[PDB]
């Protein structure tokens, strides 16, 4: 290991390995090519992971630019046009692992690192969320979460650029492989919002999160989206009417199994709803619920019927029985 040469020589050798790992190998054209050198690079990456994991005061000031340059050269690249996996994963996996341990080390000083981990770095990182490889997206997700946490100065930039990605997805391409992972990061951020909610965030709910419900591939990221929406209503109950009315607007207009995820989101909203907000939206909500109960899709009908077994929802229905019963049972009440 690096640990086994004299302490005077260790930084030099560490830098030397980081630079060797800037050599890039092709795993696609000829997959049996250069196996000896590929292994040399894998072992060097693995050695550097161990070295920063098991030693202290080894991330010195000259290490920072070398680490960031090594990451960039390996990771910032044009992406190709069940899932398609990244053939270079045997190396990229270890670069992600090492960079993560770099960020999480007790030696790590954000006041030094911020000179190299900047808006440009975050821009290029965020482009990689469109990777087809779910393992890459998973490492990216964790990495960006760590960066957002440790770099206060980058937080506004990260939020804005995720919004740019979301806007292009909604209004242009309707195709992006990592919406779910980005919403997962946003969920953790929304949960930490202070009160009262900044106007920036309410705009983000109303202009970004709600319109995400209209994109045809919604089912891929819907659980993560619902979680973000519910967190907003736990923070500020006065946003209930615009959220519920928008959800009702985006509700499928043919009977569909996709209504199941809409019923899930809506029940999760009702679980945190205030009685006075409930009365505002109960009539349109239960008109939709009545249609779902009568759905010719068995799973939709059953799913809607379960609302009656939610004790809290039933207490709200029962306190407003005179207005809700005639909607749920027109030929009776």
């Amino acid at each position: 290991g690096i640990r086994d040469v004299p302490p005077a020589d260790q930084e030099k050798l560490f830098i030397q390995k980081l630079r060797q790992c800037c050599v890039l190998f092709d795993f696609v054209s000829d997959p049996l090519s250069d196996l000896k050198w590929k292994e040399v690079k894998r072992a060097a990456l693995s050695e550097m992971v161990e070295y920063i994991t098991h030693n202290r005061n080894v991330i010195t000031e000259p290490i920072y630019p070398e680490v960031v340059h090594m990451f960039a050269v390996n990771m910032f690249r044009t992406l190709p046009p069940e899932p398609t996996l990244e053939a270079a994963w045997p190396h990229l996996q270890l670069v992600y692992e090492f960079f993560l341990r770099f960020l999480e080390s007790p030696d790590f000083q954000p006041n030094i690192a911020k000179k190299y981990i900047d808006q440009k770095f975050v821009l290029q990182l965020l482009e990689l969320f469109d990777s087809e490889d779910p393992r890459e997206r998973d490492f990216l997700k964790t990495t960006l979460h760590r960066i957002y946490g440790k770099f206060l100065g980058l937080r506004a930039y990260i939020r804005k650029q995720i919004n740019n990605i979301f806007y292009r997805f909604i209004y242009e391409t309707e195709h992006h492989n990592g919406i779910a992972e980005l919403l997962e990061i946003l969920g953790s951020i929304i949960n930490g919002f202070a009160l009262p909610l900044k106007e920036e965030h309410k705009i983000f709910l109303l202009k970004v999160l709600l319109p995400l419900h209209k994109v045809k591939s919604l089912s891929v990221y819907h659980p993560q989206l619902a979680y973000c929406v519910v967190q907003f209503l736990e923070k500020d109950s006065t946003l209930t009417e615009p959220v519920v009315m928008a959800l009702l607007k985006y509700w499928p207009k043919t009977h569909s199994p996709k209504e199941v995820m809409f019923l899930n989101e809506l029940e999760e909203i009702l679980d945190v709803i205030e009685p006075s907000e409930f009365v505002k939206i109960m009539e349109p909500l239960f008109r939709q619920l009545a249609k779902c109960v009568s759905s010719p899709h068995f799973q939709v009908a059953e799913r809607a019927l379960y609302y009656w077994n939610n004790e809290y929802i039933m207490s709200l229905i029962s306190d407003n029985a005179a207005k809700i019963l005639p909607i749920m049972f027109p030929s009776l009440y």
């Binding site: 964790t142 946490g149 206060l152 953790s188 951020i189 949960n191 930490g192 202070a194």
Partner: peptide, 8 residues
């Protein structure tokens, strides 16, 4: 899974 991040 991801820990909350407190606004600051």
């Amino acid at each position: 899974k991801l820990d909350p991040i407190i606004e600051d």
